[PDB]
Design a protein around this nucleic acid. Structure first.
Ligand SMILES: Nc1ccn([C@H]2C[C@H](O)[C@@H](COP(=O)(O)OP(=O)(O)OP(=O)(O)O)O2)c(=O)n1
Ligand SMILES: [Ca+2]
Lengths: 956, 353, 352
DNA sequence: GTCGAGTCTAGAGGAGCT
DNA sequence: CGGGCTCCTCTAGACTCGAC
């Protein structure tokens, strides 16, 4: 079984190479082999021996087609046929005019000829153009929808719109969604519209696929984010006429160019109420129909161009599968939300106490104008606005005396109540407090009013002044042109008190043990605070950036070091930094996470496997979140989702960062998945190898990438990390910056940021050594730039073209870095498409009960049946093998090394956590997953364990 | 200590300096509390009751007697736990044998010191299914610690410590970082059903509580706060000499005053306002009855040492335009407010705190 | 008999059926009170506090310990009077030695019978001897008014004059229980004797400012049993319905649920329950029950528990928001909007 | 007629992920 | 020339509308 490359690389075993690449491989060019050996020994890499990995014998399923490419093309065609048929039928359809009067009934209504509305249970069509309107006021329920069929027009109205009721249940169920059922549903940003179809939430997958015109626009003529900013600012420059923003207005104006598409100015769904929508029903339905028609036009103008520029059937057959993502949740989701919000509120309230105390004690400086000598609160607005206008014991009182005194005091009090008329109708807000203090206190009219300066936070520009922060014995100071700095005293060229600052620095230098005398980011004398020098704070991104807050996570090392100190002293500044670092993520992401649309499956909708499992709680609720993924949201055609592709991994200190761990498979199901090992690194290495000599590891970079393992710690990431001293997860950033055009200064800054021990000189020397290296990775760079500079850059594997906005004909040498990165990133997207096609083929062929769950780029999760976890793991290993072999085949290599042929580990867990051996202990989850929710640690299996468990057979 | 002098002078404590030492205050041998310490402790008890008993469908009050009758002769109770267990079977009729449920109490417990010390302690006895005992213990640990930290100026002084019993029973211990050291203010114990079976010998079908569809003998959990040491912790926490007690814990909220004249109309207005605030649950210090007229600086210092949230000054001008002078303990900034709106602002300030 | 059976069953009087006795309830030697009895006594104590301490600027709370150490070998306190006198000298600082002023307390007092403890409400009034009898009559009138205020039949709360063994005048209050009049409060004009005894020599400390001159003040003791007052009001209130006063009844509104779906209707019930509690209305969470009894049986049970109103949430409450509202006193059923309920209840409690 | 509060928007800087 | 994205809060400017 053992086989070797001409450069002594253990290649794929005989029993697998014969089944995949077939016999008859030509002998490699001996001149090329000698050239590669000379190149390897030029950099001192030839002659290093590697251990022979145990060869794998496996009976692969029949790869019909003739070779790998034909096999994948046939799979993609057989998967995408019934939906391409429906899309074609949509393209060749004549539609009657939009009805003038829309039905008001509840449910689906079909408009026959002459606009005759007819109640129909569901659209009896295999192809629809869809749009769902949602009233944000009430919640996340669908409000109304209009659908376009090849024959008729359809409209949908909900109970919560046609029917009035005091209360509607807040927990969504599939009984208040849109019933749409080999169906195809077309729409612009159809991920939003998919989430409101009731059959998309069952575990058993109905054969429905969704086509997105937003994704097709991004594929055909997408635009970079910087190019997005330039295009918006305007609204060579020829690209501004072949590309547009992702709005249906701009997309329609680009592809179709008809009369401008008009949106409703009132925004009765975003900023309106249910009564406002019952009032303007016909207007909103007609706007919905106009948008559906614009989507139909854009689809007609887009389907040809997409198949022209993305002609491989695998691209579409994978984009169809990448839009049926499915996350199952349970009652632990609500617990997670409540616990994370409560912990966030606790820590925020602690910090607010600490700051509001400092605010209140500073108002006492107003008496006597003492703030003028405060080196922090001297430049604030300390103004007061005036109020505006238009005997011996008598004895026990008798009862009549009691009543008379009571009533007369009451009347004396109530007669003054009439003097309210002299008060202005606008109530003044804290006129007796200084100016900087009124702004911190919410007005009494606010529904969330709290006593004191309740609006204070660490990001405000007064907090580094109320905390009396100092940097190296210098008071912090803010300039409107340089961000935060500090006032180095002793310069001789409300006023700034410079004698107070000199006294403060003298006290610091005589107490701490210290001694024109300072060197820092530089005396930017444009600020010109009299009597002192304004030195800027050093920012982690360089000396050109501005620090937006001295409480950023890059200052905690400087805080603990002793340069950045708080005035109160002790653990006040460190605790402020720690709490900010703990609540940074949830502060941004709580509106996203808490507003996810969860639909709770009733016990009737759950399958028998779930309901008969001994772990099925009769009191718990099981639901599902359909991620609203845009299957192509970048110029590189990556998927985009604001929450789940941005979800944080469980950190020990981050609040709410156990988000993905709350995606827990239902009883009877397990989550089988794997992560591609050094995906883009191997892609770049194999591209360089195919460009250099046509053998794996012919280049020095390819040989370095290929030789090693992650477990042994001898892989390229770990080797680089040990070489520099940084962690592997930061060696990723370091090497990826090196590949993606980062200069040596970036490496210097990265080393100084990560490895605090390394000074400027050491980091600069190491960066120069590692970038100086006719280099180790020169062939990969040359091939990537050759692909980028060609007339029509295409992916070497599937052939998908670059966006028309990024061709060299329309751009005269600009945005070149984005184009060169597009090659590798779109190659990764092609890898993902191939994996999805192959996994779907294997599941269909060998009768594995499971469905695609989610794919966060390099990762791919499948909600497989519990009994099919090992067959699914074997299928995942086989698909990785075939994807790598196809990648090699399309590059003309005809062989695959054994090291990269299989997944390092196929995780079989009941959560979406990164590693199986993780308890996900965060401030919001201090006990852990197992203690609180009862999630046992899963198992990660290698290829050999999977073969031993499955006997190497996918059939069972 | 200056704080103890302030507490004696401002009638938070009682007795002489010799009678009020750290050990006597921490034991219960102090002569008692002043009229302000009584109200601060009442505020603590009210907040504890609100947090624990009021907003729970399952927590009920319980009446445990002060003396332990019978075996030869009786004694004085040392904890409220023992008396609460005697009501477990009777209180299963209220919850219809549903679990979990609780019994809560605030009372004085007598500890040998041979001197005798009295402590005001708030206890919750939580009967939970044995499978959920650890999760309920963690829940109550978090709930109690956040309740203690809620009114604190420095919540980091309150801490927690996971402990263990002689019988290997998991527990917890809260603390307050007093200037000398850490002192135990609360203790949560996962006792189990040993005490229930010892107290109720015989058939255990009498003790069965419904864990959903499964009857089970509950595991007992006990929480035992310390209200006397709690208010001493808050007096040390709050402490220009000012006691920055929480707006919900400050014994006195507002302090009324007067001008020089006209006395007959100003005193009628002040009596009307005084009755207005008392009818709305705002404790008032009748400073307009004082026979001695002092500089506003001295009066302000006196009111700050007593934790007075606001100082209301009614002058002859109030008779014309209805405006009063309002001062704030926290900021020392004087504002003008119409006398008709004062009660609403004060209720807003106390509730929103 | 029937009343005590109801009270024990409805958790007014905790303990065994045989363990409850008339003389055990009138002596403090009883197992204790159920949660309803505890909340009723808490209501009574709050009413006493508001009507004595809160509105009077001369009255301050006092902190007396349970035990009395030192040679007389400690001793449990038998009355709240002596602990108040020990605070007399140091509590002249609150009023700047100005007379009159008072010290009021509610606490437990241990009476030998067996040790039978009674929770008593006391007020010691330090007044100059000139106006002692006038203040005694004033307090007598006010205490009688307070006791009669909540009574459904205020004719039973009588009063009488008495002479002490030392010739000191005083008054006594009695509730006319069905078996006879039991003493629920007593007022005494004991003058200075004790203040001097407890403080022999240096009467300059005991002197109080009776206007301009300084005098030693006569003390007045008003002492009333809150436990026997609770018994008196339970007998006053008591078809088996306990018509306790709205300000004394432990639980005001009994919240309930009546139909399906369970999870949609219990969210409404929980929201209403949280709203009512935030405004200081005691609610009985009857909606948590899984096994539903007859509506008439719930009405009888809640009438026995002195719950003012019964609120029923049904299917219709989801459509138009109307809840069923039943009044304990008038046994009248009506429908009102759920948003109007809290204001209605607050105004009803305030009106009484 | 003029002036201050509510609103609305846009830019800067920080922070998640791959 | 690290790249591609996503979203958040804080601040300053501009505009509008009602009240003196
Ligand atoms: N700072 C980063 C992080 C990631 N990526 C790209 C390159 C990777 O190929 C891809 C996936 O990131 P991974 O973290 O998976 O990088 P690796 O695949 O090298 O990690 P591993 O080998 O552990 O899968 O994203 C990048 O360019 N820059
Ligand atoms: Ca990877």
């Amino acid at each position: 079984q053992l086989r070797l490359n001409p450069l002594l690389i253990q290649m794929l075993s005989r029993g697998l190479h014969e089944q995949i690449f077939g016999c008859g491989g030509e002998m490699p060019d001996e001149a090329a082999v000698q050239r590669s050996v000379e190149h390897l020994q030029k950099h001192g890499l030839w002659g290093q021996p590697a251990t022979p990995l145990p060869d794998v014998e496996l009976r692969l399923p029949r790869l019909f087609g003739g070779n790998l490419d034909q096999h994948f093309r046939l799979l993609a065609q057989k998967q995408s046929l019934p939906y391409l048929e429906a899309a074609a039928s949509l393209l060749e359809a004549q539609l009657p005019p939009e009805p003038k009067s829309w039905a008001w009934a509840e449910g689906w209504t079909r408009y026959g000829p002459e606009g005759e509305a007819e109640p129909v249970a569901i659209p009896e069509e295999r192809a629809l153009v869809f749009d769902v309107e949602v009233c944000l006021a009430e919640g996340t329920c669908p409000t109304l929808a209009v659908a376009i069929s090849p024959s008729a027009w359809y409209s949908w109205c909900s109970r919560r719109l046609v029917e009035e009721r005091y209360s509607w249940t807040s927990q969504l169920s599939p009984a208040d969604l849109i019933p749409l059922g080999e169906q195809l549903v077309v729409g612009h940003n159809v991920s939003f519209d998919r989430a409101h179809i009731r059959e998309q939430y069952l575990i058993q997958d109905s054969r429905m696929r969704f086509l997105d015109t937003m994704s097709m626009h991004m594929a055909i003529s997408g635009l970079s984010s910087f190019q997005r900013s330039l295009w918006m600012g305007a609204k060579s420059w020829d690209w501004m006429d072949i590309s547009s923003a992702n709005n249906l207005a701009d997309v329609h104006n680009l592809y179709v160019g008809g009369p401008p598409l008009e949106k409703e100015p009132r925004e009765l769904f975003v900023k309106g109420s249910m009564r406002d929508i019952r009032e303007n029903f016909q207007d909103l339905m007609q706007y919905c129909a106009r948008d559906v028609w614009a989507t139909f036009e854009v689809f007609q103008q887009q389907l040809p161009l997409f198949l022209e520029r993305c002609p491989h059937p695998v691209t579409l057959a994978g984009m169809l599968e990448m839009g049926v993502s499915y996350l199952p949740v349970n009652q632990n989701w609500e617990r997670y939300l409540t616990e994370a919000q409560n912990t966030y509120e606790e820590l925020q309230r602690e910090m607010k106490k600490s700051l509001m105390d400092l605010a209140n004690d500073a108002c006492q400086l107003l008496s006597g104008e003492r703030y003028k000598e405060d080196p922090w609160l001297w430049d604030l607005e300390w103004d007061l606005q005036e109020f505006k206008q238009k005997q011996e014991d008598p004895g026990p009182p008798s009862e009549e005396e009691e009543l008379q005194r009571s009533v007369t005091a009451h009347n004396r009090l109530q007669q003054l109540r009439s003097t309210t008329d002299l008060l202005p109708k606008r109530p003044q807000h804290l006129p007796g407090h200084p100016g900087w203090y009124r702004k911190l206190c919410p007005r009494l009219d606010d529904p969330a009013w709290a006593p004191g300066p309740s609006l204070l936070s660490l990001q405000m520009r007064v907090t580094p002044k109320l905390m009396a922060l100092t940097w190296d014995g210098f008071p912090l100071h803010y300039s409107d042109s340089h961000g935060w700095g500090y006032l180095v005293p002793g310069r001789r060229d409300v006023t700034c008190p410079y004698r107070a600052i000199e006294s403060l620095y003298r006290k610091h230098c005589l107490e701490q043990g210290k001694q024109t005398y300072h060197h820092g980011n530089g005396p930017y004398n444009d600020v010109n605070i009299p009597g002192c020098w304004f030195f800027k704070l050093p920012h982690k991104d360089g000396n050109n950036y501005n620090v937006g807050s001295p409480f950023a996570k890059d200052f905690l090392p400087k805080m603990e070091d002793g340069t950045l100190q708080a005035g109160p002293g002790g653990a006040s500044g460190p605790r402020a930094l720690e709490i900010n670092k703990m609540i940074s993520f949830w502060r941004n992401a709580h509106k996203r996470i808490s507003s996810q649309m969860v639909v709770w499956l009733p016990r009737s909708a759950l399958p028998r496997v779930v309901t008969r499992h001994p772990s099925f709680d009769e009191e718990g609720h099981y639901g599902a979140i359909l991620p609203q993924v845009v299957t192509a949201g970048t110029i590189t055609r990556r998927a985009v989702e604001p929450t789940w592709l941005t979800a944080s991994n469980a950190r020990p200190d981050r609040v709410g960062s156990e988000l993905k761990a709350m995606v827990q498979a239902p009883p009877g199901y397990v989550l089988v998945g794997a992560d591609v090992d050094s995906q883009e690194l191997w892609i770049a290495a194999v591209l360089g190898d195919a460009h250099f000599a046509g053998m794996h590891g012919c280049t020095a970079f390819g040989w370095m990438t290929l030789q090693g393992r992650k477990s042994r710690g001898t892989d390229l990431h770990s080797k680089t990390a040990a070489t520099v001293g940084i962690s592997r997860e930061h060696a990723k950033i370091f090497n990826y910056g090196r590949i993606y055009g980062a200069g040596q200064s970036f490496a210097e800054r990265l080393l100084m940021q990560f490895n605090h021990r390394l000074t400027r000189q050491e980091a600069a020397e190491k960066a120069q050594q590692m970038y100086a290296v006719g280099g180790t990775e020169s062939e990969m760079f040359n091939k990537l730039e050759s692909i980028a500079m060609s007339d029509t850059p295409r992916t070497p594997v599937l052939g998908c073209c670059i966006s028309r906005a990024l061709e060299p004909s329309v751009v005269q040498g600009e945005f070149i870095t984005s184009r060169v990165n597009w090659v590798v990133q779109s190659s990764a997207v092609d890898y993902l498409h191939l994996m999805l096609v192959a996994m779907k083929w294997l599941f269909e062929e060998f009768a594995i009960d499971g469905r695609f769950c989610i794919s966060i780029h390099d990762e791919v999760r499948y909600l497989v049946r519990e009994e099919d976890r090992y067959r699914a793991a074997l299928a995942l290993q086989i698909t990785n093998l075939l994807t790598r072999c196809m990648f090699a085949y399309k590059l003309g290599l005809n062989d695959l090394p054994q090291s990269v042929a299989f997944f390092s580990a196929v995780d079989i867990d009941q959560c979406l956590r990164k590693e199986v051996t993780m308890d996900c202990k965060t401030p919001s989850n201090p006990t852990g997953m197992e203690r609180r929710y009862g999630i046992p640690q899963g198992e990660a299996l290698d290829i050999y364990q999977i073969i031993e468990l499955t006997k190497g057979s996918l059939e069972k | 200590e200056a704080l103890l002098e302030i507490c004696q002078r401002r009638h938070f404590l009682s007795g002489s300096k010799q009678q009020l030492s750290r050990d006597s205050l921490l034991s219960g041998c102090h002569p008692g509390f002043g009229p302000l310490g009584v109200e601060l402790r009442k505020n603590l008890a009210a907040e504890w009751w609100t947090s624990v008993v009021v907003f729970r469908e399952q927590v009920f009050p319980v009446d445990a007697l002060h003396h332990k009758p019978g075996p030869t002769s009786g004694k004085l109770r040392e904890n409220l736990l023992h008396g609460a267990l005697e009501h477990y079977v009777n209180c299963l009729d209220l919850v219809n044998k549903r679990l979990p449920y609780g019994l809560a109490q605030i009372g004085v417990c007598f500890h040998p010191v041979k001197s005798i010390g009295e402590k005001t302690e708030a206890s919750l006895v939580w009967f939970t299914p044995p499978r959920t005992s650890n999760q309920w213990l963690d829940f109550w640990l978090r709930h109690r610690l956040q309740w203690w930290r809620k009114f604190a100026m420095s919540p980091s002084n309150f801490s927690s410590s996971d402990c263990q019993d002689e019988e290997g029973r998991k527990g917890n211990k809260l603390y307050y970082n007093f200037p000398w050291g850490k002192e135990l203010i609360e203790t949560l114990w996962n006792l189990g059903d040993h005490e229930l079976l010892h107290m109720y010998p015989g058939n255990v079908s009498k003790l069965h509580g419904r864990d959903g569809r499964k009857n089970v003998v509950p595991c007992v959990l006990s929480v035992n706060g310390d209200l006397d040491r709690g208010m001493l912790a808050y007096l040390y926490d709050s402490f220009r000499k000012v006691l920055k007690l929480h707006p919900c814990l400050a014994p006195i909220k507002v302090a009324l005053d007067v001008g020089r004249g006209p006395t007959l109309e100003l005193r009628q207005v002040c009596q009307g306002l005084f009755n207005e605030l008392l009818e709305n649950g705002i404790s008032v210090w009748p400073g307009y009855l004082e026979t001695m007229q002092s500089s506003l600086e001295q009066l302000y210092s006196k009111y700050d040492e007593m934790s007075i949230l606001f100082t209301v000054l009614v002058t002859e001008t109030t008779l014309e335009n209805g405006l009063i002078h309002l001062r704030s303990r926290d900021t020392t900034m004087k504002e003008m407010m119409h006398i008709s709106k004062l009660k609403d602002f004060l209720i807003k300030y106390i509730s929103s705190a």
